[PDB]
Paper text:
Inhibitors of the viral enzyme [name] (EC 3.4.23.16) are important components of Highly Active Anti Retroviral Therapy (HAART) for [name]/AIDS. During virus maturation, [name] cleaves viral polyproteins at nine different sites of varying amino acid sequences.
[name] tethered dimer used here contains a five residue linker, GGSSG, linking the N-terminus of second monomer to C-terminus of the first monomer. Three dimensional crystal structure, determined to 1.69 Å resolution shows that the Q product peptide generated within the crystal is still bound in the active site of [name] along with a set of water molecules. It was found that the full length substrate was cleaved at the specific cleavage site (Leu-p-nitro-Phe). The N-terminal product peptide (P product) had diffused out leaving behind only the C-terminal product peptide (Q product) still bound in the enzyme active site. The Q product and the water molecules were placed in two orientations, consistent with the pseudo-symmetry of [name] active site. One of these water molecules, WAT1, which is activated through hydrogen bonds to catalytic aspartates, is located at a distance of 2.7 Å along the direction perpendicular to the scissile peptide bond. WAT1 forms two short hydrogen bonds to outer and inner carboxyl oxygens of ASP- 25 and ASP-1025 respectively. Further, WAT1 does not accept any hydrogen bond and is a donor (see below) in two strong hydrogen bonds with catalytic aspartates. Unlike in unliganded structures, the position of WAT1 is asymmetric with respect to the catalytic aspartates.
Residue numbers in the entry: 1 to 99, 1001 to 1099
Write the structure that this text describes.
């Protein structure tokens, strides 16, 4: 299946005998699921995201059926606001990003030019919005708060911002704030015709 990003890329998964919905998230290294019942041993672990950090339980060798496709790997269980299927499992179902074709064995980083500056950013299908590290942008902005896996952060919202993503031009909203990594979200990914394929 190929999938566009005009809507969040949700898939049905089966894990631990239970059926759940999860977001295919190219910006996540790991798979993180809402608190749920899984059998077996686990190790305490700490992961980060926008907002800060959360403690999770790490289960290994977990079988998961993602949109019918089987994969086995590490699954983290904790207080995430949404169930996320990260690259550790996306590579097993042969997921690719298309806009060039991009595989997910490494983080999908691209070079962007915005506000006259060159930066690197992560193509993130799990992000509704585009969020960049503090930087100098011209013009008016509006205060806004956004959430992520570890809580929330305050950002500055700039609209009608031109960005060149891997050579492709797009114009849209860009949030600027304390994100640990520059993220290109669906609002811009749709403009460069990015598709998720597996
Ligand atoms: N949506 C991503 C945004 C993100 C990517 C990479 C970093 N980092 O290297 O520091 C921070 C934020 C996200 O929240 N990714 C998390 C998801 C949880 C996980 O995979 O463990 C991440 O840790 O990659
Ligand atoms: N990597 C994603 C994980 C995520 C997706 C959706 C929600 N949610 O609807 O509540 C929470 C976590 C991520 O960090 N998404 C953030 C990125 C920042 C942004 O786009 O505003 C999100 O808010 O979607």
């Amino acid at each position: 299946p190929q999938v566009t990003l005009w809507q969040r890329p949700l898939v049905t998964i089966k894990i631990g005998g239970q059926l759940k919905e999860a977001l295919l998230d190219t910006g996540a290294d790991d798979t993180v699921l809402e608190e749920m019942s899984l059998p077996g041993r686990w190790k305490p672990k700490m992961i980060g995201g926008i907002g800060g950090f959360i403690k999770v339980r790490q289960y290994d060798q977990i079988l998961i059926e993602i949109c019918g496709h089987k994969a086995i790997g590490t699954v983290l269980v904790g207080p995430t606001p949404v169930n996320i299927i990260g690259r550790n499992l996306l590579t097993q179902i042969g997921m690719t990003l298309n806009f060039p074709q991009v595989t997910l064995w490494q983080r999908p980083l691209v070079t962007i030019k915005i506000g006259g500056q060159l930066k690197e950013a992560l193509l993130d299908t799990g992000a509704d919005d585009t969020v960049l590290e503090e930087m100098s942008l011209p013009g008016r902005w509006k205060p806004k708060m956004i959430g992520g896996i570890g809580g929330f952060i305050k950002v500055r919202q700039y609209d009608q911002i031109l960005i060149e993503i891997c050579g492709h031009k797009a114009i849209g909203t860009v949030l600027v704030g304390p994100t640990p990594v520059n993220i290109i979200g669906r609002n811009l990914l749709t403009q460069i015709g990015a598709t998720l394929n597996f």
